């Protein structure tokens, strides 16, 4: 399979034609989504099967190949970009201030932006290009629009 | 069977379309993975 660094689509043929169930992130030999996206299942690149090797429903993310090698982390303080890679159009950078989702546990980066389901797992990046998390895990607010955290997992 | 197909290179572009608020919100986080609002 196609293990080049970059932004892949995940699709399936199990509904309708070919449907865009989410994005994910090529790293280091290892891709990175959300768990909602894929629900643990092995994926095809070409005529190559990638296995999962990570994943945690409650963090929402799954690694496939080898373990989740995204650990830069947002600064609470600048812009940031989604890639988003919505069902049927071209990747495109959007740059946008984050708001906190404040927790129990801890204050988290949130991006306001409002994408198809399908956009589920496109990546938040920082100045530097680096993947700061996973947009498409979050909440929707007394407007009805969506807001997401900026997710991202652990480098062990 | 789920299928990947590479969408672009992971870089920053000088000039995108800045957009978005930036809100506080008081959120909860359920053991399947859910964020709520907490008010
Ligand atoms: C169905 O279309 C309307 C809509 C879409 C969304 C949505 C928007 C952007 C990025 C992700 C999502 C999203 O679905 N997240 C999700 C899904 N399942 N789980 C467990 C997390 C949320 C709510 N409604």
Redesign the pocket.
């Known amino acids: 399979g196609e293990t080049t660094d970059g932004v892949y689509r995940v699709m399936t043929r199990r509904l309708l034609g070919s449907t865009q169930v989410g994005v994910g992130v090529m790293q280091e030999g290892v891709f990175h989504t959300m768990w909602?996206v894929t629900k643990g299942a092995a994926l095809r690149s070409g005529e190559g099967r990638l296995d999962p090797y990570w994943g945690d429903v409650k963090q929402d993310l799954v690694s496939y190949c080898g373990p989740w090698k995204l650990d830069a982390a947002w600064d609470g303080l600048s812009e940031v970009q989604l890639l988003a890679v919505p069902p049927g159009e071209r990747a495109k950078n959007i740059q946008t201030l984050p708001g906190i989702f404040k927790t129990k546990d801890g204050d988290i980066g949130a991006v306001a932006l409002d994408?198809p389901?399908g956009?589920?797992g496109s990546p938040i990046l920082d100045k530097c290009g680096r993947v700061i998390g996973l947009?498409?895990?979050g909440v929707?607010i007394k407007n009805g629009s969506?807001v997401?955290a900026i997710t991202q997992g652990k480098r062990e | 069977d789920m299928y990947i197909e590479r969408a672009g290179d992971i870089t920053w572009e000088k000039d995108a379309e800045v957009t978005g608020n930036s809100p506080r919100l008081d959120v909860a986080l359920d053991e399947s993975?859910?964020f709520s609002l907490v008010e």
């Open positions: 909602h994408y389901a956009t589920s947009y498409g895990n929707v969506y997401s | 993975g859910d």
